[PDB]
Amino acid sequence: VTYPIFTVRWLAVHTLAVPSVFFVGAIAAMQFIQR
Amino acid sequence: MFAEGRIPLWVVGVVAGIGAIGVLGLFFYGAYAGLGSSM
Amino acid sequence: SIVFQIALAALVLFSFVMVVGVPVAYASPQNWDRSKPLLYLGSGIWAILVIVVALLNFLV
Amino acid sequence: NLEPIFQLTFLGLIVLAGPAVVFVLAFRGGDL
Amino acid sequence: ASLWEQFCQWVTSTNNRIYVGWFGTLMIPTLLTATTCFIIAFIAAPPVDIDGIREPVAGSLLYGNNIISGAVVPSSNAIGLHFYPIWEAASLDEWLYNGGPYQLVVFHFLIGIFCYMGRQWELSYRLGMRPWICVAYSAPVSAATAVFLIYPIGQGSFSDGMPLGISGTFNFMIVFQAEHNILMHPFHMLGVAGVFGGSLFSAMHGSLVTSSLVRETTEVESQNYGYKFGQEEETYNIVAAHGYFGRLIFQYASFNNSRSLHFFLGAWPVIGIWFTAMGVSTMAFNLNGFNFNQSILDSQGRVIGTWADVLNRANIGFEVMHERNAHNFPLDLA
Amino acid sequence: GTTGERPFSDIVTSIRYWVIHSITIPMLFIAGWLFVSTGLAYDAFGTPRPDEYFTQTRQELPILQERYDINQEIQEFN
Amino acid sequence: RGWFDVLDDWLKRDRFVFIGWSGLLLFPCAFMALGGWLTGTTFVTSWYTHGLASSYLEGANFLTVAVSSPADAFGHSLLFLWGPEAQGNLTRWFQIGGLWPFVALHGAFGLIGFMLRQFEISRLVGIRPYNAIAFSGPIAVFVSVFLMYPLGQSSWFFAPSFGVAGIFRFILFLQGFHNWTLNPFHMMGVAGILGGALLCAIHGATVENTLFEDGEDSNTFRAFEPTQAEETYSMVTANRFWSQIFGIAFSNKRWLHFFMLFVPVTGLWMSSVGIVGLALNLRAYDFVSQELRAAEDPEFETFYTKNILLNEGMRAWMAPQDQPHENFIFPEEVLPRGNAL
Amino acid sequence: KLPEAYQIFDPLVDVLPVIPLFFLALAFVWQAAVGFK
Amino acid sequence: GGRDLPSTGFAWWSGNARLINLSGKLLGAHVAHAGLIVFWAGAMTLFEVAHFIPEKPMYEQGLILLPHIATLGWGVGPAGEVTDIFPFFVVGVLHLISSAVLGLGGIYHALRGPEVLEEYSSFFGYDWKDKNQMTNIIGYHLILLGCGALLLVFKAMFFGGVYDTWAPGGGDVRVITNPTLNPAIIFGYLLKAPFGGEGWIISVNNMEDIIGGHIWIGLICISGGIWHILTKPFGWARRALIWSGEAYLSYSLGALSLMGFIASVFVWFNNTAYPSEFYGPTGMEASQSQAFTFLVRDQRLGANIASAQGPTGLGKYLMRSPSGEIIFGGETMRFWDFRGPWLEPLRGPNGLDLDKLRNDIQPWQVRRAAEYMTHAPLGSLNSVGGVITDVNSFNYVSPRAWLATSHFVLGFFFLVGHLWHAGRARAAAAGFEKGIDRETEPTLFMPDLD
Numbered sequence A: 001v002t003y004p005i006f007t008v009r010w011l012a013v014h015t016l017a018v019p020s021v022f023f024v025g026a027i028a029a030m031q032f033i034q035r
Numbered sequence B: 001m002f003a004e005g006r007i008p009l010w011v012v013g014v015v016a017g018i019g020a021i022g023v024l025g026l027f028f029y030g031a032y033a034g035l036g037s038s039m
Numbered sequence C: 001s002i003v004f005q006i007a008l009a010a011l012v013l014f015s016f017v018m019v020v021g022v023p024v025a026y027a028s029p030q031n032w033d034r035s036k037p038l039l040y041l042g043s044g045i046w047a048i049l050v051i052v053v054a055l056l057n058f059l060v
Numbered sequence D: 001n002l003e004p005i006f007q008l009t010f011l012g013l014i015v016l017a018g019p020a021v022v023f024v025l026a027f028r029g030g031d032l
Numbered sequence E: 001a002s003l004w005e006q007f008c009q010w011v012t013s014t015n016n017r018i019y020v021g022w023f024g025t026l027m028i029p030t031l032l033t034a035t036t037c038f039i040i041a042f043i044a045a046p047p048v049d050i051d052g053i054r055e056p057v058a059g060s061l062l063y064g065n066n067i068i069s070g071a072v073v074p075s076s077n078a079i080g081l082h083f084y085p086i087w088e089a090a091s092l093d094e095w096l097y098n099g100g101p102y103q104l105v106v107f108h109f110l111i112g113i114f115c116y117m118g119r120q121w122e123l124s125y126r127l128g129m130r131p132w133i134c135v136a137y138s139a140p141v142s143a144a145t146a147v148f149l150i151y152p153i154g155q156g157s158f159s160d161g162m163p164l165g166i167s168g169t170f171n172f173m174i175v176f177q178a179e180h181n182i183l184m185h186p187f188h189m190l191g192v193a194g195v196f197g198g199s200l201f202s203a204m205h206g207s208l209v210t211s212s213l214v215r216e217t218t219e220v221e222s223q224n225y226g227y228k229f230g231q232e233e234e235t236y237n238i239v240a241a242h243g244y245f246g247r248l249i250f251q252y253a254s255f256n257n258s259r260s261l262h263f264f265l266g267a268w269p270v271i272g273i274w275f276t277a278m279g280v281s282t283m284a285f286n287l288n289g290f291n292f293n294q295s296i297l298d299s300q301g302r303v304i305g306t307w308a309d310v311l312n313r314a315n316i317g318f319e320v321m322h323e324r325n326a327h328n329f330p331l332d333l334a
Numbered sequence F: 001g002t003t004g005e006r007p008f009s010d011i012v013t014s015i016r017y018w019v020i021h022s023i024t025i026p027m028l029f030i031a032g033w034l035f036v037s038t039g040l041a042y043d044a045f046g047t048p049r050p051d052e053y054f055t056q057t058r059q060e061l062p063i064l065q066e067r068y069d070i071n072q073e074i075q076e077f078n
Numbered sequence G: 001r002g003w004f005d006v007l008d009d010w011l012k013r014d015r016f017v018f019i020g021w022s023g024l025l026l027f028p029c030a031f032m033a034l035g036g037w038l039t040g041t042t043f044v045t046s047w048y049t050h051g052l053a054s055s056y057l058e059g060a061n062f063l064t065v066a067v068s069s070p071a072d073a074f075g076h077s078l079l080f081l082w083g084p085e086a087q088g089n090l091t092r093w094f095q096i097g098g099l100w101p102f103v104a105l106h107g108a109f110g111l112i113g114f115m116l117r118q119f120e121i122s123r124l125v126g127i128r129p130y131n132a133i134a135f136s137g138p139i140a141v142f143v144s145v146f147l148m149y150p151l152g153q154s155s156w157f158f159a160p161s162f163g164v165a166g167i168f169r170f171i172l173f174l175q176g177f178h179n180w181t182l183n184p185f186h187m188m189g190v191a192g193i194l195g196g197a198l199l200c201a202i203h204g205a206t207v208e209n210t211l212f213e214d215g216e217d218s219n220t221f222r223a224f225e226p227t228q229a230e231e232t233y234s235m236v237t238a239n240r241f242w243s244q245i246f247g248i249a250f251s252n253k254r255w256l257h258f259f260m261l262f263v264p265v266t267g268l269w270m271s272s273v274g275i276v277g278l279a280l281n282l283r284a285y286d287f288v289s290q291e292l293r294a295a296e297d298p299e300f301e302t303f304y305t306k307n308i309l310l311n312e313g314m315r316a317w318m319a320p321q322d323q324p325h326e327n328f329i330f331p332e333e334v335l336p337r338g339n340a341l
Numbered sequence H: 001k002l003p004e005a006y007q008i009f010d011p012l013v014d015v016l017p018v019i020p021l022f023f024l025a026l027a028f029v030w031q032a033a034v035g036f037k
Numbered sequence I: 001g002g003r004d005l006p007s008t009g010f011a012w013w014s015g016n017a018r019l020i021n022l023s024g025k026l027l028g029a030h031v032a033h034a035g036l037i038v039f040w041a042g043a044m045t046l047f048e049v050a051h052f053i054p055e056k057p058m059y060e061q062g063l064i065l066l067p068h069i070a071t072l073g074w075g076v077g078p079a080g081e082v083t084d085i086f087p088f089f090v091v092g093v094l095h096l097i098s099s100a101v102l103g104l105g106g107i108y109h110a111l112r113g114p115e116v117l118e119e120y121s122s123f124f125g126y127d128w129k130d131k132n133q134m135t136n137i138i139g140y141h142l143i144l145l146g147c148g149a150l151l152l153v154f155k156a157m158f159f160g161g162v163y164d165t166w167a168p169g170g171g172d173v174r175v176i177t178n179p180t181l182n183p184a185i186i187f188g189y190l191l192k193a194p195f196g197g198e199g200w201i202i203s204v205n206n207m208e209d210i211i212g213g214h215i216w217i218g219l220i221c222i223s224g225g226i227w228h229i230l231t232k233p234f235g236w237a238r239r240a241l242i243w244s245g246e247a248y249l250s251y252s253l254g255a256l257s258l259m260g261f262i263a264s265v266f267v268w269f270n271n272t273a274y275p276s277e278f279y280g281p282t283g284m285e286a287s288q289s290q291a292f293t294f295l296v297r298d299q300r301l302g303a304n305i306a307s308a309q310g311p312t313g314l315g316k317y318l319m320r321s322p323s324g325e326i327i328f329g330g331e332t333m334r335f336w337d338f339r340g341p342w343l344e345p346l347r348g349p350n351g352l353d354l355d356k357l358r359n360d361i362q363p364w365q366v367r368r369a370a371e372y373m374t375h376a377p378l379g380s381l382n383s384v385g386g387v388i389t390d391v392n393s394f395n396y397v398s399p400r401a402w403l404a405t406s407h408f409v410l411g412f413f414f415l416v417g418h419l420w421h422a423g424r425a426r427a428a429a430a431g432f433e434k435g436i437d438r439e440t441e442p443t444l445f446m447p448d449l450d
């Protein structure tokens, strides 16, 4: 109960998830590029 | 919902799974439209 | 001709309401007193809608 | 046009249907 | 009591050094037949006209092959899918020239390996075991059946079965890639995941068990002598192995249940091999790997190359050279 | 067996996590979207747009050939 | 308490993700390699190095994206962002294939960091370091294939590209130009990998089907306890089964698991030796006796000679597109091909 | 295509055959709601 | 019955095993699953109708159900031209609605209906060990299966006929007036070698044989149904078989694996029950078509195709089979057992006839050969037609390829399932499916091997 919020685990999670969601948004947008 | 103050984990799983399925469906759709579709 | 369109759209709507309601009603043993007659009525009305659609197919 | 719009409408309704059944049963106390 | 009953007790006996069983009553003759014919042919078979164009291919050691290049050559394309036993040849020389040894060896081998799988079930039943080792063995059996029977059936000729040789195997694979793009087939990718991952999990499991061995020997003798056959106690510390692995990656990615771990070890390569066997079996019906040739166009309409196009160039290079005298018409449909 | 950190299930089933993330996650999604859809990615990474693979004067592959002055080579490739 | 001990304490704390001293090397380098691959496959072209589209932005898919090798013009230049080629220009650095050495070198140091992590965690928990020793195999593969092979060749251009179809291209290239399947070191690698898969499957199945009845459920998975002292499956029954089915069987558990380590690791090491050979074009390409006989006897045909013909076809048809910097111009009439095809 | 009177439900018939896949998924939804008992 | 691991002994991922002894719940599962099957039939039919361009061939549009309806003689005319699109729609609609009904019943039995049926009725209640009741269910379903076969016969004979690709004057829907009831032909099909040139039952090549075999199948099934209703398994069957629900499942799995393999082969080779008009050419057909197309072209160019020897010395266009028959040359030599309605008019007693080849080739045969050659069942997974080295502009994968690959895969995995359940049924009947008993571990009482 009443754990820390920010930890090494928090940083490890975000270091991956944050650019992952950014990249996924980029690729989603690419799905609509027309030649 | 069934309990107050928290979301059931199965509801979160269903929502995240549907989001992931939609993302993969968009990618497969894009395989047939726009760039890389051979048309 | 619009009557067929209306009947088929109604049939799809009633199929949706049956698809939702039937599993809930069969899996709520407490509310079986008032959901068994509702099931009977709904099955009858769904069949009626299907029959009406079938007739309007040849009427349109 | 509108074909993908209507298609996604039907698809989303269908998709919600099953989870709607499970959610309603879970919340109302049905057997699961 | 009766003679037949005595024979039944002998065949199903668990005291035989090699279990025979009822599946064994088929396995042993067919496997011995296949082995003897294979050895004889590999050593001394004369050249075989595999492509049915009167262009015999030397497969045996006595006709100039080494172990790497030697093979039992698939039967002639002229035979197609016809049954070609010895008694349908005018002479043994004709049978040899048309690749009859291949059919004999392959048919007996296939019967033998299916009976081997049944025999695995049978012995598990006689010993009071659980019955599913044969299910694991069904993966290599499925793969072998795909390359020796299913692919020739779909392609319409036993000449398009895998040759029984090392270089023949490579030829089979290269032509297969040229015609089906097996590398770009997701079932073959799953097979690669199956074997790469199976080796990975074999290395991890062996290394984690070896790493966590309980001290029972001295630094002189082999640590293997710390285990005694039939000992009840555990020979390694699975809790220490779990501590190490769950700290190597993270806690919840590490098995601490040996049974779940061993099920995973069994299941991963078996499933991968099932998928790759089905990949070959469905490419037998020319449902091929992905084709992204000229998938990327620039705005004007000129094709922009990708690595798939380079791969296609390699495939074409293989395609135009293979069986160089066998094709009369522009499309390689057969 | 917990190494000290809050269990993931507890965090991701909590209201506060979702109040935070129903905003943060979509914002990164549409930030990557805008990265692509504004043309920023093309210019940042040097990736050709579909109409810039070839120019009205270069119909061939702009394969780099010079060992040290690639900036000028790429500029003459356009 | 000295500052070094305090740092050592913090690095080795029991947390969800262990860091350790090795983490200082592993995590930044591994993150660089992974993010470099993801960035390149998402955004970065190979138009100027290979004349190929290799990113999602260009319309390629998961199977066709890659971090492609740099242009052959750079030889074995390490292609630092600040180096004489890119000269600090990030866009140009991307365009010349600078991401390939970025990923390769950061991945090499990440692999070193991961194996140091295996050593460090093994030492901390008090077990033998055989996991790191097993991991030496993948390290040998990565070193040979991604570093030594291109180093023996003309440039990094001929290293495998970090991508699915890029790897497939590398595989077919090695078949056509090196006859890599004929190489005995590759055959030992194949034997090791297929044997490792076989051992994995057979051991898992054998254990699962000789389990002791330790629970009442049909679900046998919860009839095990990690702290139990006794074996969970019958080694004696397994040994009898395999002795009667196959002729031989393991009787020593320790030897069994060491073998499961040994087979795939030795396979990887042997294949790496073969790749080192191919780096210098020291191939097992031909059997000279059969070549000479075929040259003087036009009726001598083996599967080996047929494979040689396939290699010739692949080289001629693939080289102009695969090696665009060479400006190979092979007119249609010089291309080898069989009849009607 | 569909007979003329029915082509307003053309974008509905486009998605009908894929429903049994949703049934298979729904099995897992139901087991997840009950905690995979 | 319980619905969790503690009260059933089965985890969630094997949850359907909890149903083994809950006959009412099991019946609900079966009825609902049948609803799924019928639902797919109806929905796929409506999808295919909606995505059907009726002037383009069926096999060019990824259709697998419409060819089944067309073969039965609905909505098509000569050469397979789609006359009426309504019957396809009707088949789909009827399956969809009936699937609704079946799903309602399956849900009722699975969710609210009686858990078990044995204390409710002796007729529907069953016990897996009750051999007489199991044979009763076999008998009822055998009667139904024979009736369905007779339904096929009645459609072919009295209800407009079936599509006959071998019809004179062109392939057409025709009524079969003279099915072959001769048991020599019907049951000699079962004795033909499953190899090239014989084609055990895949070689059935005329609708008379198909309809007559279905009359025989109907009679066999109905009589066997009565036989099983009125008897109990004999002593030999009792001593040879495992008598349990999982054992019966495993038996059915083996049967299904066999049928899946047979169907894959059947669609790959047979062009009678799978007319090329609707399913496209077989691979054999396409190869033979290419050989024919270039024989025709080069002959028009002036090549004397009887005497033209190819590079190897074999005839370029014509050659002999190993039994002497005159056949197309080239690699298609392997496909000389092929028979097709467009090629048999040029075949003499000795094989391909030079006189017919030189003066009897019709323009429609040339068109058909070109079409079949260009629709060879070769294609990529992403549906790029032609050989794998071709470029992306031809969107085609043969329906034969889809059906054959899918059903070989399903046959294989059902063989796997049969092995799994047969082994498990044996182990459970003998009582060691849960593992080795430490007290009575059988190998501990065995003499050492050496």
Ligand code: CLA
Residues within 6 Å of the ligand: G218, H021, I012, I013, I014, I015, I016, I017, I249, I253, I413, I414, I415, I416, I417, I418, I420, I424
């Ligand atoms: C009619 C055929 C049939 C029937 C009635 C059964 C029935 C049963 N099987 Mg079984 N099985 C079958 C065929 C069948 N099987 C086949 C063909 C195989 C080979 C693969 C197996 C292999 C098998 C195993 C290994 C086991 C069973 C078990 C069982 C029992 C419980 C299973 C359960 O709860 O489902 C649960 C359902 C799931 C967990 C979902 C599985 C999803 C699969 C793996 C993937 C589906 C892919 C599909 C093609 C769709 C693709 C989706 C794509 C879009 C992503 C049950 C009585 C268990 C048992 O022995 O009980 C005592 C068990 O351990 N079966």
Ligand code: CLA
Residues within 6 Å of the ligand: C018, C019, C020, C022, C023, C027, D021, D022, D025, D031, D032, H024, H027, H028, H030, H031, I001, I002, I003, I004, I011, I012, I013, I014, I015, I016, I017, I018, I019, I022, I025, I026, I028, I029, I030, I032, I033, I100, I103, I104, I107, I110, I111
């Ligand atoms: C064809 C697929 C299929 C079918 C017919 C069944 C059927 C059944 N399963 Mg099962 N199962 C399946 C697949 C299937 N399963 C798979 C893939 C898994 C792995 C995840 C499982 C794992 C599993 C477990 C662990 C258990 C079962 C159990 C059961 C039985 C009880 C059902 C219940 O109470 O749950 C209740 C669920 C609900 C009340 C939610 C709503 C369900 C309805 C039917 C949804 C219908 C929606 C539909 C669109 C509406 C149309 C209605 C009408 C208008 C047409 C039942 C007969 C239980 C059992 O064995 O009982 C003893 C059990 O414990 N299954």
Ligand code: CLA
Residues within 6 Å of the ligand: I027, I031, I101, I102, I103, I104, I105, I106, I108, I113, I114, I117, I124, I125
């Ligand atoms: C093979 C499928 C099958 C089987 C074996 C059963 C079996 C059973 N059902 Mg069920 N049912 C089914 C499908 C099935 N049902 C379907 C699809 C629905 C949805 C409509 C229902 C809805 C249902 C309800 C609401 C009830 C049952 C009940 C029962 C039980 C009593 C049967 C009885 O005596 O009533 C009488 C049987 C008859 C009067 C015979 C009528 C035969 C049919 C209706 C006429 C058509 C025959 C047809 C020509 C034959 C071939 C069918 C065709 C499609 C090929 C029994 C164990 C009852 C129960 O459980 O008791 C408490 C109950 O209340 N069923």
Ligand code: CLA
Residues within 6 Å of the ligand: I138, I142, I190, I191, I220, I221, I222, I223, I224, I225, I227, I228, I231, I232, I233, I234, I237
């Ligand atoms: C799905 C339909 C079905 C099912 C499940 C059964 C099931 C059964 N029947 Mg049967 N039967 C059926 C249809 C069916 N029958 C029909 C339609 C008829 C009318 C012809 C019969 C007539 C019949 C008789 C006369 C008898 C049975 C009997 C039996 C019982 C044991 C027989 C046995 O072991 O099988 C397996 C068969 C064997 C073990 C014998 C070996 C056969 C050969 C050697 C196997 C080779 C097959 C080969 C590889 C496949 C090639 C295909 C083709 C070329 C031959 C069993 C429960 C017996 C019984 O106990 O009656 C109450 C019995 O005496 N049935």
Ligand SMILES: CC1=C(/C=C/C(C)=C/C=C/C(C)=C/C=C/C=C(C)/C=C/C=C(C)/C=C/C2=C(C)CCCC2(C)C)C(C)(C)CCC1
Residues within 6 Å of the ligand: A016, A019, A020, A021, A023, A024, B020, B023, G031, G032, G034, G035, G036, G038, G039, G040, G102
């Ligand atoms: C380059 C570079 C760099 C680096 C960078 C980095 C490091 C980054 C990054 C990055 C990253 C890190 C990114 C990411 C990403 C991602 C993605 C793109 C994802 C994905 C995914 C997916 C698609 C998945 C899917 C799925 C599946 C398939 C399975 C199940 C379900 C799911 C959904 C999960 C720097 C600047 C330093 C320098 C220069 C160079």
Ligand SMILES: CC1=C(/C=C/C(C)=C/C=C/C(C)=C/C=C/C=C(C)/C=C/C=C(C)/C=C/C2=C(C)CCCC2(C)C)C(C)(C)CCC1
Residues within 6 Å of the ligand: C008, C011, C012, C015, C019, C053, H006, H009, H012, H013, H023, H024, H026, H027, H030, I028, I029, I032, I033, I035, I036, I039, I046, I093, I096, I097, I099, I100, I101, I102, I103, I104, I106, I107, I110
């Ligand atoms: C038991 C169980 C289960 C299962 C379930 C199932 C299996 C089911 C089903 C069901 C079904 C199987 C159903 C159905 C349905 C149907 C419907 C609902 C219908 C309809 C109709 C309509 C509406 C139509 C219309 C139309 C027409 C008329 C024509 C035109 C077109 C259209 C389409 C519009 C699960 C697994 C989940 C789990 C839990 C338990």
Ligand SMILES: CC1=C(/C=C/C(C)=C/C=C/C(C)=C/C=C/C=C(C)/C=C/C=C(C)/C=C/C2=C(C)CCCC2(C)C)C(C)(C)CCC1
Residues within 6 Å of the ligand: I185, I186, I187, I189, I190, I201, I204, I209, I210, I211, I212, I213, I214, I216, I217, I240, I241
């Ligand atoms: C319709 C049709 C037809 C007809 C057909 C038929 C008439 C048939 C049949 C068939 C049959 C009539 C069959 C059968 C079968 C049998 C089986 C499949 C068996 C078996 C066996 C078993 C399974 C056994 C087992 C065992 C053993 C081995 C010993 C011990 C005991 C036991 C039981 C374990 C034709 C082609 C003409 C034409 C086309 C169409």
Ligand SMILES: CC1=C(/C=C/C(C)=C\C=CC(/C)=C/C=C/C=C(C)/C=C\C=C(C)/C=C/C2=C(C)CCCC2(C)C)C(C)(C)CCC1
Residues within 6 Å of the ligand: B010, B013, B014, B015, B016, B017, B018, B021, C012, C015, C016, C017, C019, D014, D015, D016, D017, D018, D019, H016, H019, H022, H023, H025, H026, H028, H029, H032
């Ligand atoms: C005919 C028709 C109809 C019908 C319909 C139906 C028949 C129904 C249904 C329905 C359904 C049937 C639905 C469903 C669904 C579902 C879903 C949406 C699911 C899922 C999901 C997910 C995402 C999951 C996930 C997961 C997993 C698997 C793993 C672990 C756990 C979890 C949960 C996370 C209608 C009415 C429209 C109208 C008319 C026409």
Ligand SMILES: CCCCCCCCCCCCO[C@@H]1O[C@H](CO)[C@@H](O[C@H]2O[C@H](CO)[C@@H](O)[C@H](O)[C@H]2O)[C@H](O)[C@H]1O
Residues within 6 Å of the ligand: G081, G082, G083, G087, G088, G089
């Ligand atoms: C574990 C160690 C990891 C090593 C890598 C870590 C990242 C290292 C990045 C170093 C980047 C070097 O980047 C380099 O910076 C210098 C100094 O500003 C730039 O130099 C620039 O500014 C300086 C003065 O301000 C001018 O003299 C010069 O002409 C101009 O180019 C270079 O153009 C750029 O290439």
Ligand SMILES: CCCCCCCCCCCCO[C@@H]1O[C@H](CO)[C@@H](O[C@H]2O[C@H](CO)[C@@H](O)[C@H](O)[C@H]2O)[C@H](O)[C@H]1O
Residues within 6 Å of the ligand: B009, B010, B012, B013, B014, B016, F012, H031, H032, H033, H034, H035, H036
């Ligand atoms: C984007 C954020 C991350 C998204 C994460 C998506 C995956 C999350 C999990 C997916 C759902 C798994 O579903 C999980 O199943 C477990 C099985 O242990 C069950 O676990 C729970 O079961 C029941 C809930 O009814 C509780 O009484 C029980 O105490 C609890 O263990 C729940 O059903 C759910 O917690």
Ligand code: OEX
Residues within 6 Å of the ligand: E051, E077, E155, E159, E160, E175, E179, E322, E323, E326, E327, E332, E333, E334, I331
């Ligand atoms: O034989 Mn051995 O590979 Ca099967 O593709 Mn046609 O056939 Mn031949 O040509 Mn390419």
Ligand SMILES: [Ca+2]
Residues within 6 Å of the ligand: H010, H011, H013, H014, I050
């Ligand atoms: Ca539509």
Ligand SMILES: [Cl-]
Residues within 6 Å of the ligand: E171, E175, E321, E322, E323, E324, G306, G307, G310
């Ligand atoms: Cl070749």
Ligand SMILES: [Cl-]
Residues within 6 Å of the ligand: E326, E327, E328, E329, I329, I330, I331, I332
């Ligand atoms: Cl040819």
Ligand SMILES: [Fe+2]
Residues within 6 Å of the ligand: E205, E209, G203, G207, G257
């Ligand atoms: Fe082990």
